Amino acid sequence: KRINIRLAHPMAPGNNVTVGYEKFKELVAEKSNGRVRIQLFGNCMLGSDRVTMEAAQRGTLEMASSSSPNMANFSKQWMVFDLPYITSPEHQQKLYKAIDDGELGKKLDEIAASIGLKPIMYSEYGYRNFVTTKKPIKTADDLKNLKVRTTDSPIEVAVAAALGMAPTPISWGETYTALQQGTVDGEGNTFSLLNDAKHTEVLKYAIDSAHNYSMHLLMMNKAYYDSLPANVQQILTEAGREALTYQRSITSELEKKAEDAFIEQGITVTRLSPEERAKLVERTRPVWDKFKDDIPAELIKLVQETQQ
């Protein structure tokens, strides 16, 4: 008989994370010949990121996807991935290998288990970049005294302050108005979300700072997973792994298209010099020692090992 598995997530139609979960649904159906069906509830149809991951943890929902910074609200260990410049785009393929098949992946499995969850896909969300409405930013010093919108992430706030910026936490929904009306000067996010949300209408400058990395973590209730037949577990695990291959590639392509939409809209996108990138790394590194006591050294080391 048919197994119906509900999957909740916060992302909008056509979004890189959404299309990965569509691939997941398609592969689960193919592999199970229709016996297992993923029912998608995107765009917060079942709740916010937090509401749906609590339901998955508790066992009233089978699967949910949460951003890595939002997972820090269930377990602080996930904060390792938010540290400034802990990873960079140049080493992304080795990061994926470590998560997919390596000791990093296994430790993350254990951490999820301790809060009632089984990881199924580590969806790529991307690297955040600083953008501004009116003030040109081409250098590290250009960032000093910028009023910048932040999320509620303590690491995001610390990074802004380390760079001499003035951080203001503002909900996503209030951020367009804050930029338009001038209560902040800028923000930091992926080019794809900024363009998709039409913030580009009010922006004029961007730098490829890549000062924050994140993922969207698709989790299954672990007790539920452990209740399934071996062959169904295998279907889910394999569909996840294969959908992720596609999702990581689609993310790259959508980010290129987002960056082109920026240029088309007259936004000046500065490619930081090695000298200027180095200053952002150096200025932000004290943030790691500030949060040292809250993130396990072993986990920092496993992530750094992917970068060299």
Residue numbers in the entry: 29 to 336
What does the paper say about this structure?
O. alaskensis employs a tripartite ATP-independent periplasmic (TRAP) transporter (OaIsePQM) to import isethionate, which relies on the substrate-binding protein (OaIseP) to scavenge isethionate and deliver it to the membrane transporter component (OaIseQM) for import into the cell. Like the ATP-binding cassette importers, TRAP transporters utilise a high-affinity substrate-binding protein (P-subunit) that binds the organic acid and delivers it to the membrane-spanning transporter subunits (Q and M) for uptake. The structure of TRAP substrate-binding proteins comprises two globular lobe-like domains connected by a variable hinge region, which is formed by two β-strands and a unique extended α-helix.
Of these three datasets, only the 1.48 Å dataset was truly ligand-free, whereas the other two datasets had sulfonate-containing buffering compounds [4-(2-hydroxyethyl)-1-piperazineethanesulfonic acid (HEPES) and 2-(N-morpholino)ethanesulfonic acid (MES)] in the substrate-binding site arising from the crystallisation condition (see crystallisation and structure determination methods). We had suspected OaIseP had tightly bound a non-cognate ligand present during expression in E. coli, a phenomenon that is not uncommon for TRAP substrate-binding proteins as documented by Vetting et al.. Upon further refinement, we were able to confidently model HEPES and MES buffer constituents from the crystallisation conditions into the densities (difference maps shown in Supplementary Figure S5) and refined the structures to an Rfree of 0.229 (1.89 Å resolution) and 0.241 (1.65 Å resolution) respectively. In both HEPES- and MES-bound structures, the sulfonate groups form a salt bridge to Arg177 and hydrogen bonding the side chain nitrogen of Asn217. The smaller MES utilises a bridging water molecule hydrogen bond Ala40 to the morpholine ring oxygen. The melting temperature of OaIseP (TmD) in the presence of MES (5 mM, 58.5 ± 0.3°C) and HEPES (5 mM, 57.0 ± 0.6°C) is not significantly different to that of ligand-free OaIseP (ΔTmD of 0.6°C and −0.9°C, respectively).
